[PDB]
Amino acid sequence: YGGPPALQVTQPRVVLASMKGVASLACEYEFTGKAKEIRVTLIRQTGNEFHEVCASSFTTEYEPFDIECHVQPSENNVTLTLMGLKATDTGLYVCRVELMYPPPYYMGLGNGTQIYVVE
Amino acid sequence: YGGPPALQVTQPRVVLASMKGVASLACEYEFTGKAKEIRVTLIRQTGNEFHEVCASSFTTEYEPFDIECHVQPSENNVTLTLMGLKATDTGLYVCRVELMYPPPYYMGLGNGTQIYVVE
Q: What is the DSSP string of B96-109?
A: EEEEES--SEEEEE
* B48 shares contact with chain A (CB less than 8 Å): no
Q: Does A17 sit within 8 Å of B90, measured CB to CB? A: no
Task: For residues B64 and A66, give the distance between their C-alpha atoms in angstroms, rounded to a whole number.
Answer: 55
Which contiguous run of DSSP H or E holds residue A11? none
Beta-sheet pairing, B23-29 with B77-83: antiparallel
A–B CB contacts, 8 A cutoff, strictly below: 227
* B102 shares contact with chain A (CB less than 8 Å): yes
Kindly state the greatest CA–CA separation across chain A: 78
Work out the burial of residue B30: count CB atoms within 10 Å of its CB; fewer than 13 is exposed, 13-18 middle, 19 or more buried.
Answer: middle
Q: What is the dihedral of CA A29, A33, A34, A39, to 10 degrees?
A: -30
Work out the burial of residue A42: count CB atoms within 10 Å of its CB; fewer than 13 is exposed, 13-18 middle, 19 or more buried.
Answer: buried
* A50 shares contact with chain B (CB less than 8 Å): no
Q: Which of B16, B97, B117 should be substituted to probe chain A, the one whose Cβ sees the most A Cβ atoms within 10 Å?
A: B117
Domains of chain A: total: 1
Beta-sheet pairing, B23-29 with B9-10: antiparallel
Task: For residues A17 and A81, give the distance between their C-alpha atoms in angstroms, rounded to a whole number.
Answer: 10
Q: Does B93 sit within 8 Å of A119, measured CB to CB? A: no
**Residue A43 CA to chain centroid, in angstroms?**
12
Q: Are B113 and A95 in contact (CB under 8 A)?
A: yes
Measured over the CA atoms of residue A25, residue A29, residue A41 and residue A33, the dihedral's sign is positive
Task: For residues A25 and A27, give the distance between their C-alpha atoms in angstroms, rounded to a whole number.
Answer: 7
Q: Does A106 sit within 8 Å of B98, measured CB to CB? A: yes
Secondary-structure breakdown of chain A: helix, strand, coil percentages, each rounded to the nearest 5 = 5, 55, 40
Which contiguous run of DSSP H or E holds residue B15? strand B14-16
Where does residue A76 fall: left (phi above 0), alpha (psi -120 to 50 degrees), or beta otherwise?
left
Q: Are B93 and B45 in contact (CB under 8 A)?
A: yes
Resolution of the experimentally solved model in angstroms: 2.3
Q: How far off is chain B from A104, nearest CA to CA, in Å?
A: 5
* A10 shares contact with chain B (CB less than 8 Å): yes
Q: Are B118 and A17 in contact (CB under 8 A)?
A: yes
**DSSP SS3 for B10:** strand
Expressed as residue numbers, the domain containing B63 is: 1-119
Measured over the CA atoms of residue B44, residue B45, residue B51 and residue B52, the dihedral's sign is positive
CA nearest neighbour of A73 among A43, A101, A38: A38
Q: Which residues of B touch A12 (CB under 8 A)?
A: 113
Q: Which of A106, A111, A119 should be substituted to probe chain B, the one whose Cβ sees the most B Cβ atoms within 10 Å?
A: A106
Q: After which residues is chain B broken (C to N over 2.5 A)?
A: 65
Measured CA distances, A72 to A24, A43, A63, B44 (Å) = 11, 17, 14, 45
CATH of the domain at A49: 2.60.40.10
Q: Are B21 and A116 in contact (CB under 8 A)?
A: no
CA nearest neighbour of B19 among A116, A98, A99, A31: A116
CA nearest neighbour of A72 among A6, A114, A27, A5: A27
Q: Are A29 and A76 in contact (CB under 8 A)?
A: yes
Which residues contact residue B18 at a Cβ distance below 8 angstroms, ignoring those fewer than 6 apart? none
Alpha helix (H) residue ranges in chain A: none
* A69 shares contact with chain B (CB less than 8 Å): no
Q: What is the dihedral of CA B26, B30, B31, B32, to 10 degrees?
A: 110
Residue type, B85: L
